[PDB]
Structure formats: C-alpha cells, structure tokens
Amino acid sequence: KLQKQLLEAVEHKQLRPLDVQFALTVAGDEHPAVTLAAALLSHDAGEGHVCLPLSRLENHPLLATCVSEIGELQNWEECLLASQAVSRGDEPTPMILCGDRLYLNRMWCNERTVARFFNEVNHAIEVDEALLAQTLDKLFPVSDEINWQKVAAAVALTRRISVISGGPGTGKTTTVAKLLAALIQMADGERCRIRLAAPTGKAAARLTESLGKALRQLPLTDEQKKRIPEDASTLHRLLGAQPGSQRLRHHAGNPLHLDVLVVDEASMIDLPMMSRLIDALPDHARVIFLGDRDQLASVEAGAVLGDICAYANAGFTAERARQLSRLTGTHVPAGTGTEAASLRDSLCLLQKSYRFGSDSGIGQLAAAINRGDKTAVKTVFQQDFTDIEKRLLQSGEDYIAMLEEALAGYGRYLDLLQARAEPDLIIQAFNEYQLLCALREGPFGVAGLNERIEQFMQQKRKIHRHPHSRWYEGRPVMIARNDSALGLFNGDIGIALDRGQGTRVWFAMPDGNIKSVQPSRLPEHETTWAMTVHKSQGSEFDHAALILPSQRTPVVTRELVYTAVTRARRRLSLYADERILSAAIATRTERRSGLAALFSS
Template identity: 30%
Template sequence: MKDLPEDFSAWCDREREAGRMADIDRGLLILTRRGQPQTGSEEETLLVLLMVAILSRARRDGHVLIDLDEVQHHPWVLSWKNRLPDPSRWEAILDAHPLVTGPGEGPSPFLYANRCLYFSALYRQESFLARSIRERLSLGAREPDARDQEILRLASGGVEDRRRLLEGALFRPFFLLTGGPGTGKTYTSAEILKVWKILRPEAHLVVATPTGKAARRFREALSLPEVDVLTLHRLLGISPGGASPGEDRPLVQDLVLVDECSMVDLSLMARLFRALSPETSVILVGDPDQLSSVGPGSVFGDLALAMSVEQKTRPEISRSFQVLTRNYRQDSWDDFGRLAEGVRQGDAGTVLEILASGEKSGPIRWIEPRTGAIREIGKTLIEAWLPVVESRSAEEAWEKLGQFALLGAVREGPLGTRTVNRLLRNHFENRSGCTRRFVPVIVTENSVESGFMNGDPGLLEMEGNTAIRAFFQGPGQTMRVASPLLMPAWEEAFALTVHKSQGSEFDHVTVLLGSESNALLSRSLLYTAVTRARKRLTVYASRGVLREALSNAGGRSTGLFQALLATGRKESAPG
C-alpha cells in the first residue's frame, strides 16, 4: 500500500491545521496515491496529487472544474513550484494517468477535457444537462389556436410583452424566467400556472423549490390548491416502497415549474432533467445575481447568461427566455433600488455614498466597526429580537418573527452565526423576568415522515432552559404545534447565514460583516443580503470589507456556459 510522500504528507497536515484543507481532501489524496503507477517520477506524482487536492477543495467551494492554465497561479502550486514538472508537460502527464480519462472513455474518478480537470461525475452531469436543455430548446412549440389566442389576450390585458411572455411559458417545452427582487417573479409564475389550468384543465402541474420554506411561501402566493407545491428533494426523492424518478420511471407531470433556481446545484438539476419525460414542459425561475447553490455549480446563472448571449444571434431563443426588469417593491431610483443595483454592478462609489448618507433613524443605516460600535450593534440586535422573545403568546411571536433578520456571511468566528446565536441566547436566558420566552429556530434537515423540511422557520417555547413546545407554519395561515422531542435536526435562528435567508424577505435586515477579510465575501453575497430588506437595512461592515465584497464577482469555474453555447452552435450549423 503506497503512502503519501513524507514531506507532502507533512505539508497536508499543516494545511489542514490552518483550515485550508479538509479531511475529505486528504482522504481523496490517499486513494489517489494508491492508484498511481509505480513507474511515475516524483515530480509527476506531486503534480497529480496537487491537482487532486486543488480539485477537491474547489468542489467544496462550489467549483465544477479547475483550469490548468489558471491553476498554475494557485498558492498550493506555487509552494511546490520548484519540484513540479514544466507546465508544458502537465496535460500529457494527466492524460496518461490511469485514474484520468477523457470524454467518452471508460469509467474513472477524474476526467480531463479542454485543458480542465473534473471529477468525472460532475463532468457527466454537466454534459447531460447541457444536452438536455438544448434538446428541449430545439423542440417545436405548440402553436396557439384561436381559443388560446383569445385567452392569452385576456390574461395579458392586451399588453403585447405580457402576451409574448405567457405564450412562451405556456406553449414552449422549456422556458427561463429571471428578474431581481420585487420584479414579480412569483406573481408572474402564479399567473402562468393559472392560465395553464384555464387552457388545459386536466393538466397535472407541480411547483418545486429547493427548500420547504420556499415551497410554503409559493403555496401561499399561489392560492391554487389543485397545483402541487413541494420541495425538489421530495419530488425526486425515494418514497417508502418505491423508486426514485429517473429515465426509466419519469415524472408524469405536464409541467414542472422550479422556483428559486439559483439555489439548485448541478447534481440536483441534472437529476431533475434525468427524471423528466419528453412530454413534460419545464419553467425555471430565479435571480441569477443571487448567491449560487451550496453545492457545486452555478447552473441558473450559467443558463441565463448563455441564453442572453445566444438570443442576439438566434432570435428564436427569446421566445423561451424572459427577463423581468420593473421593480414593483421599490422605486428603482430610491435608495434601496439604487443600492441593490450598485451592489449588483460592483459600483463601490455608489454603494458607499448611499450607505454614508443614511441617517441613524432612516431606512438605511451603516455602522462602521470602531470603538463602541459592537456595543451599539449589540443593543440594536437585542431591541430587534426582544418583541419576539418576550411575546405574550405564540401567535404574537409568530406574527413578529418575519419582521427582522440578522444575516452573517459565515457560521464560525467572532461574527459567525453560531457565535451570535450563542451570545443572544445567553443574554435572553440571563435576562431578569425572561424565564418564559420564545426562541427562533430553523430546521436543518428534511423529514418527510414528520412533515418538516430543511429551512422551515419555527419557534421554541422555553420554560427556563427547557423547550416545552415548538411552533411552525401549518396549512394556510394556521400554526402547527409539535413536540421538541419529535423534531428533526434544528438550530437557533437569531442569526442566519445569507445562504439560509434566500427566498425570504423581512421588514428590517441587519447584515453583519465586520472588518475582517473573508474568502466568502462576494458581490452576490452582499446583493442577496441587502435585497432581503423591505423597509429597513442596517449594515455593520468596514469600508474595506465592503470594497472587498464588491470587487469579488464570485464567479465559479464551470463548463456549463461553454457547453450550452457549443451544443447550440452544433444545432445551428448548416448541413
């Protein structure tokens, strides 16, 4: 059994202690080393191990691939630069390795294509998804007859842009609907579903979302009980005694509409398309500028960009693609609208100007880290949560629960959500007269049997340090009471990561970024955070941290955009 080279193993230990390498990365390196040929030189061995280490870390950071030209400047490569082969030989070394294959070759853990290294499974998912979407885009649309045209005219109110949107969503097998916060994505989606039912009353429609919270929010907005609204995991998951939907057992719905698509990773989206029958229409809805999924890929952003680029040369693409631009929630020229657009564009001057002009009691407030600032922000947080914690009833607490959100970039560290949750919990536990209180929580795993879904917000009623009852959203506007002992995994939710807040809106949002540089800071994270606020926004961040976030476009290394364009060029080529 071959072990890692001694000096490389020691280096891995140092990187792991520094938090730059995870146990799963090291485990993969050991498996890779065992599969390496005995004849390889030391420099070839080091190159392959380094590429695998970087690829493994990249996957944890949401990337699908590593580019051989870009990876030459990676800190891990630079630290071993003097002991690696010349970059001109890297491609040949990887291509000859027994654990690395090319497209269309036999099974292997890694795949090399277009000067990029992938995990083979992710490459297959990406290729399959690009091909599946292209096949749907190439299918002919059903032409509306006279009755259909009249229904479209009435449903659109005679507005031609609206009529074209509805026609594309109703008669084409694939449709993409994008737009920023407040542009009416949910309203438009609901209208599409309602007109679908008018045109085809017997049609089986389903709405799928990445989280249970998003499913409940959409269900309330839809008010159409004959349309199923459930999580993607539930739609695609294994039911007791049954098999998961797939190519040999496709979904039977006439339409699948997926909301909050920016949160859907590559693997889950590929699994959805693998489960679709050729007769099922698909509508994908989301905001491509929001944070990408937790898992690898930026599927919705890549898809929106590819269709935006291609419709310039292939006008027919525009029939399957619509961008909503009018903001119904905020005037595009008020401070909220200007701030969101400034963040989206990475315009630090505009963002800092708007934040700096905010008044202490105004709708937008900026608190810069300084002496006494943490006490000020702490007081703000306590005052914001006190009405919920000290509510006289669960109904009162629930009504106030959605009014405030405290959002952080990370879970760990001085301003991590775990730390802040612990500090606020301790404060309210020790507060005089606060023995009976309500604590905000969030479910962190799906439990189909008990009806809980990952992301469901709730309340725990506490007597001293004992949770006696749990409250969650029930059907409609009712409240569901549950035993804390029967709940799936959960955590306190005084503070949430920005990722967990996606799909939600709050009257007042406080964003905790502090003054420390962080690899997770990005334009999309800040954009997602500030656009959760409806009426008030408080930002606790240094000028430097804000500039860092705005300068980081936060793109992920994927091949989907290029794969979509490549398949599109093949289809449109003559002959």
C-alpha cells in the first residue's frame, strides 16, 4: 500500500523515520489518506508545530505524489474520523480531530490546559486603589507621561496571572523589583512566599544576582527584607523533575507551596513544561512571566509566549484602560473592540528601552528587522550610523578580511593575555567581542570557526599553541552541562591560563570572585571562539559580529537575526549576502497552534 511510497520520503530527507513508523503503526491498514495525514501530522509536530489544519492537507510534495493513491475525498473529516485512529475525545485515540485541526493526544491535552489556565482560571484581585497608587507613586516619581513600567506593575498587582513582554535592556528586572516591593509592602501581616524560576541555570543565577542587587537598593524594613527570596531555581528543580522517569515530585495532587512565582525568560518555556507547571500550581498563587515575544522560540514543539503576546497588539480592554488610568494617575490608551478581555488585560508590553536610544543604529535596525521590511533595513545600513557595520562575504578573500577584523576585535583581550595580567581583567575583557554563527559545523559554524581562528592565531603571532598539549594557555572554553559541585552552569565561559602554579581555567562567579579549576576537574566543554545564536541568549557583549552562511537553511530566520542584533550592547557587525538577509527577514517563523482560535472562542 502506501508503505512503499512512504519508504521513498526517507530517501529524500523530507519525512523522518519516526513519522513513517508512527503512521505505519497507528494508521494500520486503513485508507491511505489516513496514513498520509498521520505522517504529515507527525512531521509537523516534530518540526515544532502544535496542530495541523485540514486546509494544510489540501493540495507537501509527498501529498501531491500520493494524490493518485488516495484518490479524491469529498470530506477529509469524514474519512479521518471514520478510522479508529482518530476520535473527538470520547474514547482515547492517538490522534484527535478538533474542529478543522489535527492534534496528537499528548499535544491536545497540554493545549487545552494552557487555554483554560489563561482564559478561566485567572481572576482579578481587588485591593485599595488609593493605597496602591500611593505606593506606586513612591516607587515611580514621574507622572507627567505614561510610564509603561507603572502600567505593568499595576496589571501584575491587579490580575492573578500576568505576563510582561519587552525587548532586551528595556528595564524588565527593575520593573519586577518594583513589583515585588509593592507586593510585599501591600500585604503586611499575611505570609508572602516568593519563588523564582528560570528554564536555565545560567539565567537562574543571573536572576538571583539581579533581583538581589535590585531589592537591596529599594527602601524596605527588616520585615520586608526577611521575605526576600533566598535563591532562584530551575523550572525542573522547582517541579522536582526526576532524571530518568517522567514522574514529578509535585504532581496535580500535590500542589506547590507558593504565594507568588516569577518565571524569567519565558521565551524558552515550551508547551509541555508550561502545562506541567500549570498542573502543579494552587488556586491562590499569582504567577508572573518574563520574556521577549520576538526572541527566538523554544526548542521543543510549541510557542506559548509568542502566541500569547500576539493578542497584546490589540491593546487593553476599554474599562481596563480607565481602571489603569485611575490607578497610575495618568491617561492609558484603550484598545478598540472586544476580542478576549481577560487575556488582553493580563498582558502588558514595555515599549521603552532605556539601554539604547532611538537614534542609535542598533535600535532602528532591530525595529526594521522586527517589522520585516528589507528596504528599511537597507536604508538603516545606508544611513550614517557609527555603531552598525556590514561587510560582504561571498569569496574567501572576504572571509580572510572578516578574520582580520576579528583580530582587532579580540585585540585588547590578546594584549592583556600576552602582557601577563591577572585573570580578573582578562575575563572582564574577553566579554567585549564575540562572534555569533548560526550553523554549528562546516565553513560557517562553531566547529569550523574555532579551527579557522586557531589556525589564524597560529599563522600570525598572538598565542603559542602545542598540538599534543591541547591545553595551550589563553584558549577560552564554555561548559556543556550544569555542575552543582563546581558551582558552574551550562553556557558559562572560562579562560584557561597559567598563573604560575599550573595551567588552570578561571571562571567568574556571580559574586564577582574568580574560581580556578583543574582541566581534569572540568566536565564536558567546548572552545568558545564563536557562539551559536541559541546559546548566546541571556548574555550581552560590547561588540558582537554575526555571520550568516551563503546557503539557504531553515535555521536562518527573522527571530534569529533579531536576537543576534539585540545581543550586542554598543557595537554590531554583520557578515551576510545582501539578498540572503532580505530573504531571511522576509520569512517569519510560524508554529501552528489552536490558541489563536481557542482564545477567540
């Protein structure tokens, strides 16, 4: 039957073998339309899409090929639901035909959970408007114009579940500090148990340090400063996720003993972990999320923060606008129309970036890229901006010039190395320049760029290298996994050097102190001359240089370039073809999920 035809898709690297096996097993010997539908659904679910609209099943080239075998179907819904492999939820089946879309039974449950949690579960908490306004005025001095931070604080205090979206360097951490301060000051006698979570250990430690330094500055009594959260954890450790099994220490039956929870960097939060977190929350806990919608989406299948903030463009509810105007003591704009009041009110967007001004080339470039207008990006490049640079990379002679520019980029670090300085200054200097590549291997990629840069530092005298040693002084490394013994996290950098006692790697702890580790003691690590855009999330470099390959790959997209641009602090350089950049910015990443339909109905 269709099995022989599906055997060909594996050869062309269009359909994964997992999808083929899943279709053959579940669809069984039903009509070939069912098998084809199952294979395409499994493929889209592997590629990151949550659902599969039947309109998509209407004429993938494999579907055009199998048109002859499947024939013509007056209604796909009839044929699909007729089989036992698809149902409407009355009986447990692997696939579920929901409305006009297809879901895996696992994905559908999580989708419904997130939907009902964001629609009906959240409630509006009522407090004194005058006291809250007085507290916020004591927190925010300026009342002449609309302060988005004040509106975000008001929203987070009003609603149980609230999300605050904003770009990098927009003052998110400060806003969360003001929020937690006002929250602690509002409830005096009631116990306030604060919890802080992050999907990555590095972001967790950064959150600990930032929230601590922020809360210590704001005036609080010894009572308030005793309710400051001790540390921030990972989402898995918070939920007590066991390594081998999928059993959770805190399941639906055992709720989390929390009053307020703050989850930083929700952009990396995927759908399954989101649902499993929702299942462990009680009915009195208030949850706050942090992240940028335009930031690169999570790895696994799903996109929560993006699909949620998509509705924030509509604006606030009419009555909610007047309510916030009465709270903040200003004039808050009102979104026209009513689509979903709860979700639109639970969302605030920070549109002001204190880090970089509007006149800066970085901000205008990021705005043009987010808008998807290639002519705008080209115009921004043409304009006289001293902090943006572009270099054409087509022939190898331009790759050599890129290496020459990377030389001057790493110049200060290399000089401080060759001058026999202390590791502290060397580590502080190393974070000034960084290369960011999309692919991992090949000509443009971490594995290739590291080798090429090492060969180029061997060709021109910067750092001596021994082939047999593999641990020549000066090489930077980064850790692959988290380690609780050494107190170093995944995605953290270190500098290997010889202070005189021996060749040791120095890491910069969040407390500012430097820690020396033996090369043998180190876990799995890799040379970090160039970083991937994915692993570069959360970090900030003074001078960043992005490298886009000449080829056309589904990895290079709009959000990747947006993150690479927002990664730099002051100076940004790009190496990419004029046409490839425009083609990449013109294509937006979409992950099909019923949330768009669910929140509207």
